[PDB]
mmCIF file of C-alpha atoms in Angstrom:
data_model
loop_
_atom_site.group_PDB
_atom_site.id
_atom_site.type_symbol
_atom_site.label_atom_id
_atom_site.label_comp_id
_atom_site.label_asym_id
_atom_site.label_seq_id
_atom_site.Cartn_x
_atom_site.Cartn_y
_atom_site.Cartn_z
ATOM 1 C CA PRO A 192 14.763 2.501 1.061
ATOM 2 C CA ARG A 193 17.538 4.018 3.170
ATOM 3 C CA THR A 194 17.914 7.176 1.200
ATOM 4 C CA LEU A 195 14.164 7.979 0.836
ATOM 5 C CA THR A 196 13.212 10.849 3.055
ATOM 6 C CA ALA A 197 10.484 13.266 3.657
ATOM 7 C CA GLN A 198 11.530 15.650 0.908
ATOM 8 C CA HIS A 199 10.597 13.195 -1.758
ATOM 9 C CA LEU A 200 6.927 13.004 -0.734
ATOM 10 C CA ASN A 201 4.326 13.341 -3.484
ATOM 11 C CA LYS A 202 6.929 12.735 -6.250
ATOM 12 C CA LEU A 203 7.496 9.938 -8.471
ATOM 13 C CA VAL A 204 10.297 7.695 -7.397
ATOM 14 C CA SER A 205 12.039 4.513 -8.462
ATOM 15 C CA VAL A 206 13.357 2.156 -5.549
ATOM 16 C CA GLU A 207 15.599 -0.998 -5.587
ATOM 17 C CA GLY A 208 15.649 -3.665 -2.872
ATOM 18 C CA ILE A 209 14.748 -7.187 -1.930
ATOM 19 C CA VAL A 210 11.229 -8.541 -1.486
ATOM 20 C CA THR A 211 10.777 -9.677 2.109
ATOM 21 C CA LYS A 212 7.067 -10.458 2.503
ATOM 22 C CA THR A 213 3.953 -10.430 0.333
ATOM 23 C CA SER A 214 0.350 -10.723 1.250
ATOM 24 C CA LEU A 215 -2.750 -12.788 0.372
ATOM 25 C CA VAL A 216 -4.486 -11.526 -2.765
ATOM 26 C CA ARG A 217 -7.958 -10.328 -1.786
ATOM 27 C CA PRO A 218 -10.874 -9.033 -3.812
ATOM 28 C CA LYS A 219 -12.279 -5.491 -3.250
ATOM 29 C CA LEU A 220 -15.959 -4.774 -3.772
ATOM 30 C CA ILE A 221 -16.477 -1.879 -6.147
ATOM 31 C CA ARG A 222 -20.135 -2.247 -7.395
ATOM 32 C CA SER A 223 -23.029 -4.227 -5.861
ATOM 33 C CA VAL A 224 -26.136 -5.362 -7.589
ATOM 34 C CA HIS A 225 -29.502 -6.239 -6.129
ATOM 35 C CA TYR A 226 -33.014 -7.448 -6.863
ATOM 36 C CA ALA A 227 -36.431 -6.603 -5.432
ATOM 37 C CA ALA A 228 -38.975 -9.384 -5.464
ATOM 38 C CA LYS A 229 -42.054 -7.129 -5.116
ATOM 39 C CA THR A 230 -41.139 -4.884 -8.116
ATOM 40 C CA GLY A 231 -38.788 -6.909 -10.405
ATOM 41 C CA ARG A 232 -36.201 -4.200 -10.594
ATOM 42 C CA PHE A 233 -32.414 -4.249 -10.265
ATOM 43 C CA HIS A 234 -30.354 -1.623 -8.363
ATOM 44 C CA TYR A 235 -26.692 -0.981 -7.802
ATOM 45 C CA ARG A 236 -24.186 1.129 -5.854
ATOM 46 C CA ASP A 237 -20.534 2.342 -6.268
ATOM 47 C CA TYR A 238 -17.803 2.324 -3.690
ATOM 48 C CA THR A 239 -14.529 4.218 -3.600
ATOM 49 C CA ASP A 240 -11.616 4.872 -1.056
ATOM 50 C CA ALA A 241 -8.588 7.021 -0.622
ATOM 51 C CA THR A 242 -6.001 4.888 -2.491
ATOM 52 C CA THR A 243 -7.805 4.740 -5.868
ATOM 53 C CA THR A 244 -7.023 8.240 -6.906
ATOM 54 C CA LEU A 245 -3.802 10.535 -6.754
ATOM 55 C CA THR A 246 -5.743 13.698 -5.745
ATOM 56 C CA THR A 247 -7.515 14.210 -2.346
ATOM 57 C CA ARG A 248 -11.255 14.004 -2.545
ATOM 58 C CA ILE A 249 -14.193 14.659 -0.229
ATOM 59 C CA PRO A 250 -15.319 11.276 1.447
ATOM 60 C CA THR A 251 -18.730 9.817 0.523
ATOM 61 C CA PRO A 252 -19.100 6.824 2.749
ATOM 62 C CA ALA A 253 -22.193 5.211 1.183
ATOM 63 C CA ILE A 254 -23.816 2.229 3.108
ATOM 64 C CA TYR A 255 -24.539 -1.237 1.912
ATOM 65 C CA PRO A 256 -28.202 -1.235 0.853
ATOM 66 C CA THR A 257 -30.510 -3.789 2.250
ATOM 67 C CA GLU A 258 -33.844 -2.244 1.426
ATOM 68 C CA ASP A 259 -35.442 -0.242 -1.444
ATOM 69 C CA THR A 260 -36.463 3.382 -1.474
ATOM 70 C CA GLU A 261 -40.095 2.118 -0.676
ATOM 71 C CA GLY A 262 -39.142 -0.280 1.981
ATOM 72 C CA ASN A 263 -39.140 -3.615 0.062
ATOM 73 C CA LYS A 264 -36.423 -6.139 0.785
ATOM 74 C CA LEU A 265 -33.481 -6.774 -1.557
ATOM 75 C CA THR A 266 -31.447 -9.727 -2.700
ATOM 76 C CA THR A 267 -27.715 -9.693 -3.468
ATOM 77 C CA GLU A 268 -26.563 -10.840 -6.964
ATOM 78 C CA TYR A 269 -23.094 -11.948 -6.344
ATOM 79 C CA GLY A 270 -22.564 -12.996 -10.098
ATOM 80 C CA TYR A 271 -23.416 -9.516 -11.319
ATOM 81 C CA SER A 272 -21.322 -7.507 -8.807
ATOM 82 C CA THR A 273 -17.756 -6.506 -9.464
ATOM 83 C CA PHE A 274 -14.555 -7.251 -7.447
ATOM 84 C CA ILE A 275 -10.927 -6.264 -8.046
ATOM 85 C CA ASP A 276 -7.853 -7.935 -6.770
ATOM 86 C CA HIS A 277 -5.564 -6.283 -4.134
ATOM 87 C CA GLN A 278 -2.182 -7.016 -2.542
ATOM 88 C CA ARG A 279 0.455 -5.308 -0.252
ATOM 89 C CA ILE A 280 4.158 -6.071 -0.322
ATOM 90 C CA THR A 281 7.274 -5.072 1.512
ATOM 91 C CA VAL A 282 10.656 -4.103 0.100
ATOM 92 C CA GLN A 283 13.906 -3.934 1.922
ATOM 93 C CA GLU A 284 17.484 -2.801 1.118
ATOM 94 C CA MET A 285 19.520 -5.394 -0.738
ATOM 95 C CA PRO A 286 21.794 -7.629 1.310
ATOM 96 C CA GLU A 287 24.648 -6.840 -1.067
ATOM 97 C CA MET A 288 24.465 -2.971 -0.614
ATOM 98 C CA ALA A 289 23.352 -2.328 2.930
ATOM 99 C CA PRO A 290 25.994 -1.351 5.548
ATOM 100 C CA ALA A 291 27.364 -4.179 7.503
ATOM 101 C CA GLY A 292 26.309 -4.495 11.133
ATOM 102 C CA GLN A 293 23.426 -2.110 10.889
ATOM 103 C CA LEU A 294 19.626 -2.721 10.953
ATOM 104 C CA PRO A 295 17.997 -2.374 7.633
ATOM 105 C CA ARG A 296 15.237 -0.015 6.274
ATOM 106 C CA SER A 297 12.091 -0.968 4.327
ATOM 107 C CA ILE A 298 8.996 0.539 2.635
ATOM 108 C CA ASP A 299 5.588 -0.684 1.851
ATOM 109 C CA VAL A 300 4.151 -0.886 -1.783
ATOM 110 C CA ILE A 301 0.553 -1.372 -2.572
ATOM 111 C CA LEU A 302 -0.544 -2.913 -5.938
ATOM 112 C CA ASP A 303 -3.937 -3.429 -7.612
ATOM 113 C CA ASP A 304 -5.579 -5.493 -10.325
ATOM 114 C CA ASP A 305 -3.150 -6.369 -13.035
ATOM 115 C CA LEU A 306 0.049 -6.143 -10.992
ATOM 116 C CA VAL A 307 -1.186 -8.286 -8.064
ATOM 117 C CA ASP A 308 1.250 -11.368 -8.115
ATOM 118 C CA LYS A 309 4.196 -10.326 -10.133
ATOM 119 C CA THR A 310 6.761 -11.224 -7.541
ATOM 120 C CA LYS A 311 7.588 -13.548 -4.654
ATOM 121 C CA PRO A 312 9.493 -13.094 -1.406
ATOM 122 C CA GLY A 313 13.354 -13.044 -1.752
ATOM 123 C CA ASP A 314 13.332 -11.495 -5.278
ATOM 124 C CA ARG A 315 15.390 -8.528 -6.330
ATOM 125 C CA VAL A 316 12.927 -5.956 -7.464
ATOM 126 C CA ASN A 317 12.634 -2.427 -8.954
ATOM 127 C CA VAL A 318 9.337 -0.560 -8.171
ATOM 128 C CA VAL A 319 8.388 2.741 -9.648
ATOM 129 C CA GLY A 320 5.551 4.729 -8.083
ATOM 130 C CA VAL A 321 4.421 7.770 -6.225
ATOM 131 C CA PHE A 322 5.550 8.248 -2.607
ATOM 132 C CA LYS A 323 2.400 9.526 -0.806
ATOM 133 C CA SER A 324 1.024 10.271 2.653
ATOM 134 C CA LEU A 325 -2.552 9.493 3.929
ATOM 135 C CA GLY A 326 -4.805 10.424 6.711
ATOM 136 C CA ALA A 327 -4.006 12.838 9.576
ATOM 137 C CA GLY A 328 -0.882 12.282 11.673
ATOM 138 C CA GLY A 329 -2.997 12.567 14.892
ATOM 139 C CA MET A 330 -4.049 16.135 13.955
ATOM 140 C CA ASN A 331 -7.882 15.593 13.873
ATOM 141 C CA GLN A 332 -9.348 15.756 17.428
ATOM 142 C CA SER A 333 -7.127 16.370 20.463
ATOM 143 C CA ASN A 334 -4.913 13.179 20.002
ATOM 144 C CA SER A 335 -2.400 14.320 22.646
ATOM 145 C CA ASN A 336 0.002 11.676 21.513
ATOM 146 C CA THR A 337 2.727 13.173 19.305
ATOM 147 C CA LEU A 338 5.042 10.205 18.716
ATOM 148 C CA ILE A 339 3.384 8.902 15.692
ATOM 149 C CA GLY A 340 3.574 10.800 12.413
ATOM 150 C CA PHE A 341 2.011 10.564 8.955
ATOM 151 C CA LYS A 342 1.424 7.044 7.520
ATOM 152 C CA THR A 343 3.296 6.805 4.128
ATOM 153 C CA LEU A 344 3.679 4.257 1.438
ATOM 154 C CA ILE A 345 4.125 3.766 -2.303
ATOM 155 C CA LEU A 346 1.127 3.525 -4.822
ATOM 156 C CA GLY A 347 3.014 1.352 -7.417
ATOM 157 C CA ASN A 348 2.482 1.287 -11.127
ATOM 158 C CA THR A 349 5.620 -0.535 -12.339
ATOM 159 C CA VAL A 350 7.358 -3.673 -11.059
ATOM 160 C CA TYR A 351 10.416 -5.023 -12.572
ATOM 161 C CA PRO A 352 12.166 -8.294 -11.196
ATOM 162 C CA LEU A 353 15.939 -8.143 -11.425
ATOM 163 C CA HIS A 354 18.449 -10.933 -11.828
ATOM 164 C CA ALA A 355 21.452 -11.441 -9.625
ATOM 165 C CA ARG A 356 23.957 -14.032 -8.530
ATOM 166 C CA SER A 357 22.811 -16.827 -6.334
ATOM 167 C CA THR A 358 19.222 -15.719 -6.474
ATOM 168 C CA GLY A 359 15.835 -17.420 -7.636
ATOM 169 C CA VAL A 360 15.229 -14.945 -10.550
ATOM 170 C CA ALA A 361 16.502 -16.311 -13.873
ATOM 171 C CA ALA A 362 18.145 -14.255 -16.588
ATOM 172 C CA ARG A 363 16.464 -13.897 -19.928
ATOM 173 C CA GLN A 364 17.725 -11.972 -22.925
ATOM 174 C CA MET A 365 15.542 -10.648 -25.815
ATOM 175 C CA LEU A 366 16.655 -12.296 -29.046
ATOM 176 C CA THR A 367 16.877 -10.216 -32.195
ATOM 177 C CA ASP A 368 17.023 -11.418 -35.798
ATOM 178 C CA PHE A 369 20.622 -10.599 -36.168
ATOM 179 C CA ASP A 370 21.365 -12.891 -33.216
ATOM 180 C CA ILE A 371 19.200 -15.647 -34.639
ATOM 181 C CA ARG A 372 20.949 -15.403 -38.035
ATOM 182 C CA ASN A 373 24.377 -15.639 -36.415
ATOM 183 C CA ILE A 374 23.429 -18.607 -34.198
ATOM 184 C CA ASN A 375 21.708 -20.606 -36.797
ATOM 185 C CA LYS A 376 24.802 -19.817 -39.067
ATOM 186 C CA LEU A 377 27.300 -21.025 -36.582
ATOM 187 C CA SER A 378 25.177 -24.139 -36.031
ATOM 188 C CA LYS A 379 26.259 -25.329 -39.509
ATOM 189 C CA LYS A 380 29.986 -25.529 -38.911
ATOM 190 C CA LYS A 381 31.786 -28.742 -37.745
ATOM 191 C CA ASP A 382 33.982 -27.595 -35.015
ATOM 192 C CA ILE A 383 31.095 -25.850 -33.310
ATOM 193 C CA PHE A 384 31.480 -28.049 -30.192
ATOM 194 C CA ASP A 385 35.166 -27.230 -30.083
ATOM 195 C CA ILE A 386 34.660 -23.532 -30.451
ATOM 196 C CA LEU A 387 31.911 -23.434 -27.727
ATOM 197 C CA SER A 388 34.091 -25.529 -25.504
ATOM 198 C CA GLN A 389 37.200 -23.410 -25.749
ATOM 199 C CA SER A 390 35.255 -20.264 -24.894
ATOM 200 C CA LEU A 391 34.399 -21.391 -21.447
ATOM 201 C CA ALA A 392 36.922 -19.728 -18.918
ATOM 202 C CA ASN B 69 -51.643 7.843 13.432
ATOM 203 C CA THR B 70 -44.585 14.917 19.612
ATOM 204 C CA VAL B 71 -42.985 12.801 16.939
ATOM 205 C CA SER B 72 -39.575 14.124 15.869
ATOM 206 C CA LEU B 73 -36.895 13.147 13.372
ATOM 207 C CA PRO B 74 -34.148 10.918 15.031
ATOM 208 C CA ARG B 75 -31.326 12.923 16.593
ATOM 209 C CA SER B 76 -28.737 10.236 15.351
ATOM 210 C CA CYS B 77 -28.223 8.114 12.437
ATOM 211 C CA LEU B 78 -29.951 4.702 12.891
ATOM 212 C CA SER B 79 -27.433 2.621 10.727
ATOM 213 C CA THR B 80 -25.202 1.629 13.680
ATOM 214 C CA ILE B 81 -27.670 0.360 16.282
ATOM 215 C CA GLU B 82 -29.438 -1.289 13.422
ATOM 216 C CA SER B 83 -27.077 -4.149 12.491
ATOM 217 C CA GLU B 84 -28.538 -4.621 8.983
ATOM 218 C CA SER B 85 -25.965 -6.951 7.625
ATOM 219 C CA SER B 86 -22.450 -8.271 8.016
ATOM 220 C CA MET B 87 -21.110 -6.154 5.101
ATOM 221 C CA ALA B 88 -23.039 -3.222 6.799
ATOM 222 C CA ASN B 89 -20.500 -3.490 9.571
ATOM 223 C CA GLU B 90 -17.685 -3.114 7.045
ATOM 224 C CA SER B 91 -19.459 -0.091 5.399
ATOM 225 C CA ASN B 92 -19.712 1.850 8.714
ATOM 226 C CA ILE B 93 -15.788 2.161 8.826
ATOM 227 C CA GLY B 94 -13.311 3.266 6.269
ATOM 228 C CA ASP B 95 -10.231 5.263 5.453
ATOM 229 C CA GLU B 96 -7.894 4.112 8.203
ATOM 230 C CA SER B 97 -8.499 5.067 11.922
ATOM 231 C CA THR B 98 -11.216 7.659 11.627
ATOM 232 C CA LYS B 99 -14.594 6.889 13.030
ATOM 233 C CA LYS B 100 -17.866 7.328 11.413
ATOM 234 C CA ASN B 101 -20.195 10.131 12.719
ATOM 235 C CA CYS B 102 -22.938 11.377 10.616
ATOM 236 C CA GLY B 103 -23.408 14.441 12.825
ATOM 237 C CA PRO B 104 -26.466 16.031 14.647
ATOM 238 C CA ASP B 105 -29.755 15.799 12.867
ATOM 239 C CA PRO B 106 -28.536 14.084 9.757
ATOM 240 C CA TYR B 107 -31.909 13.227 8.206
ATOM 241 C CA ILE B 108 -33.920 15.125 5.475
ATOM 242 C CA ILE B 109 -37.481 14.592 4.381
ATOM 243 C CA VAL C 189 40.326 -5.605 12.458
ATOM 244 C CA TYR C 190 42.469 -7.573 14.974
ATOM 245 C CA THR C 191 40.997 -10.910 16.113
ATOM 246 C CA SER C 192 41.932 -14.481 16.758
ATOM 247 C CA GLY C 193 40.606 -17.818 15.761
ATOM 248 C CA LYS C 194 37.127 -18.429 17.326
ATOM 249 C CA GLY C 195 36.614 -14.688 17.014
ATOM 250 C CA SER C 196 36.321 -12.107 19.748
ATOM 251 C CA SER C 197 33.953 -11.888 22.810
ATOM 252 C CA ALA C 198 30.443 -11.504 21.456
ATOM 253 C CA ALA C 199 31.737 -10.946 17.962
ATOM 254 C CA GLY C 200 32.074 -13.618 15.219
ATOM 255 C CA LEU C 201 34.918 -14.134 12.825
ATOM 256 C CA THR C 202 32.907 -14.584 9.623
ATOM 257 C CA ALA C 203 29.716 -13.268 8.259
ATOM 258 C CA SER C 204 26.649 -14.161 10.493
ATOM 259 C CA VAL C 205 22.898 -13.907 9.424
ATOM 260 C CA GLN C 206 20.308 -13.154 11.978
ATOM 261 C CA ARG C 207 16.689 -12.048 12.152
ATOM 262 C CA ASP C 208 15.721 -8.591 13.014
ATOM 263 C CA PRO C 209 14.414 -8.452 16.660
ATOM 264 C CA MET C 210 11.365 -6.316 15.750
ATOM 265 C CA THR C 211 10.717 -6.878 12.030
ATOM 266 C CA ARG C 212 11.621 -10.490 12.227
ATOM 267 C CA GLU C 213 13.760 -10.414 8.935
ATOM 268 C CA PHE C 214 17.234 -11.111 7.804
ATOM 269 C CA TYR C 215 20.222 -8.883 7.960
ATOM 270 C CA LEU C 216 24.066 -9.125 8.403
ATOM 271 C CA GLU C 217 24.595 -9.288 12.189
ATOM 272 C CA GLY C 218 28.330 -8.809 11.920
ATOM 273 C CA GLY C 219 31.406 -10.803 11.228
ATOM 274 C CA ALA C 220 35.005 -9.421 11.211
ATOM 275 C CA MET C 221 35.582 -10.778 7.639
ATOM 276 C CA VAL C 222 33.020 -8.518 6.004
ATOM 277 C CA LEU C 223 33.543 -5.577 8.456
ATOM 278 C CA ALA C 224 37.071 -5.313 7.351
ATOM 279 C CA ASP C 225 36.251 -5.363 3.599
ATOM 280 C CA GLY C 226 38.680 -3.227 1.802
ATOM 281 C CA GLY C 227 41.209 -3.377 4.708
ATOM 282 C CA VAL C 228 43.368 -5.937 6.535
ATOM 283 C CA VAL C 229 42.422 -8.784 8.853
ATOM 284 C CA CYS C 230 44.913 -9.692 11.657
ATOM 285 C CA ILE C 231 44.499 -13.343 12.838
ATOM 286 C CA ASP C 232 46.227 -14.604 16.005
ATOM 287 C CA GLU C 233 46.363 -18.321 16.840
ATOM 288 C CA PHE C 234 45.497 -19.313 13.278
ATOM 289 C CA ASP C 235 45.846 -22.955 14.128
ATOM 290 C CA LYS C 236 42.890 -23.120 16.344
ATOM 291 C CA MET C 237 39.429 -22.466 14.680
ATOM 292 C CA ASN D 253 8.055 26.319 12.511
ATOM 293 C CA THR D 254 0.730 20.646 19.824
ATOM 294 C CA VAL D 255 -0.768 22.039 16.636
ATOM 295 C CA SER D 256 -4.082 20.676 15.740
ATOM 296 C CA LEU D 257 -6.696 21.140 13.048
ATOM 297 C CA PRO D 258 -9.484 23.403 13.999
ATOM 298 C CA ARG D 259 -12.386 22.021 15.919
ATOM 299 C CA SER D 260 -14.859 24.196 14.085
ATOM 300 C CA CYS D 261 -15.299 25.734 10.697
ATOM 301 C CA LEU D 262 -13.637 29.117 10.561
ATOM 302 C CA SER D 263 -15.964 30.721 8.050
ATOM 303 C CA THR D 264 -18.366 32.247 10.536
ATOM 304 C CA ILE D 265 -15.897 34.030 12.870
ATOM 305 C CA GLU D 266 -13.982 35.064 9.713
ATOM 306 C CA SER D 267 -16.493 37.734 8.215
ATOM 307 C CA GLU D 268 -14.879 37.424 4.712
ATOM 308 C CA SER D 269 -17.378 39.414 2.752
ATOM 309 C CA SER D 270 -20.967 40.787 2.718
ATOM 310 C CA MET D 271 -22.165 37.993 0.454
ATOM 311 C CA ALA D 272 -20.277 35.637 2.704
ATOM 312 C CA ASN D 273 -22.878 36.489 5.317
ATOM 313 C CA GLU D 274 -25.608 35.489 2.708
ATOM 314 C CA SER D 275 -23.832 32.280 1.790
ATOM 315 C CA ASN D 276 -23.740 31.171 5.518
ATOM 316 C CA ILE D 277 -27.527 30.770 5.557
ATOM 317 C CA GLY D 278 -30.044 29.122 3.171
ATOM 318 C CA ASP D 279 -33.074 26.947 2.769
ATOM 319 C CA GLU D 280 -35.563 28.670 5.223
ATOM 320 C CA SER D 281 -34.973 28.507 8.898
ATOM 321 C CA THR D 282 -32.394 25.737 9.352
ATOM 322 C CA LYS D 283 -28.931 27.091 10.685
ATOM 323 C CA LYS D 284 -25.557 26.277 9.203
ATOM 324 C CA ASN D 285 -23.422 23.788 11.153
ATOM 325 C CA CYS D 286 -20.594 22.116 9.282
ATOM 326 C CA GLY D 287 -20.072 19.625 12.266
ATOM 327 C CA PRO D 288 -17.232 18.599 14.574
ATOM 328 C CA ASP D 289 -13.846 18.258 12.912
ATOM 329 C CA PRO D 290 -14.870 19.244 9.353
ATOM 330 C CA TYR D 291 -11.509 19.896 7.881
ATOM 331 C CA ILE D 292 -9.430 17.553 5.741
ATOM 332 C CA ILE D 293 -5.833 17.668 4.636
#
């Protein structure tokens, strides 16, 4: 997070750090479904926003429908609509790498759907994603203020927890068949306890 | 039964629903403004 | 870093952890022992701490 | 190298082409007005 600057914008990056604060996992409305009592028909609508696609698109802010095209009333069908999970997290520079006596730097990462609760605060994490900007940095309309800039964040797609000393993430190693054969072989000797004991320190 | 089409969109003054309040704002800080004479027949 | 036991004025002798005034999160506030990593620490009045 | 995005569409004052004059009008009498702050980044 300290060595991530404006020259890396719009490019794919991989950052390391410590998770400091997560957010509540919320649903996002994608498709609504309705019912008309006077006709017996079902209708629907789709919704989108700026963070669901990598390329810029022309906004289409559709409204939530309460009536029919003929004036009849509508009823919401919550069981037939669609919702998607959403979360936002913060990543900071690791305590074992940041300079001493200096205030730290951090960056926000947005996750969606199947990567929504893969870490907890305090973990060492590696996040790969696209460093992207959004909106207008006070350019539209007059907006005399010049102090603020462009809002930026990472649209994440990969999250990897990392194990360290004196941390809450446990180490696990993938076990191959060679390893299993060797372990099950050594299990059959009689001084196995002695060998395993003399190996410590 | 001189009627004219509305000069402004009527989805703001008409508080249709609670989610209609959500739908009338999106994409960060920018306000929603449909423009002058937004209706078609 | 040259210091005594009990540290210096407004400067501790060992690592101190504090919360960031604005972001309200942890960082190493200071501490001569870590500030001098890779160097030498000179302690005076070693018997008082 | 306070710059702001244009307040109006620039396709009218910029007479790009002869067919660009045709493209700036259509569908009977209604005038073409893109609106206030029509540009996006």
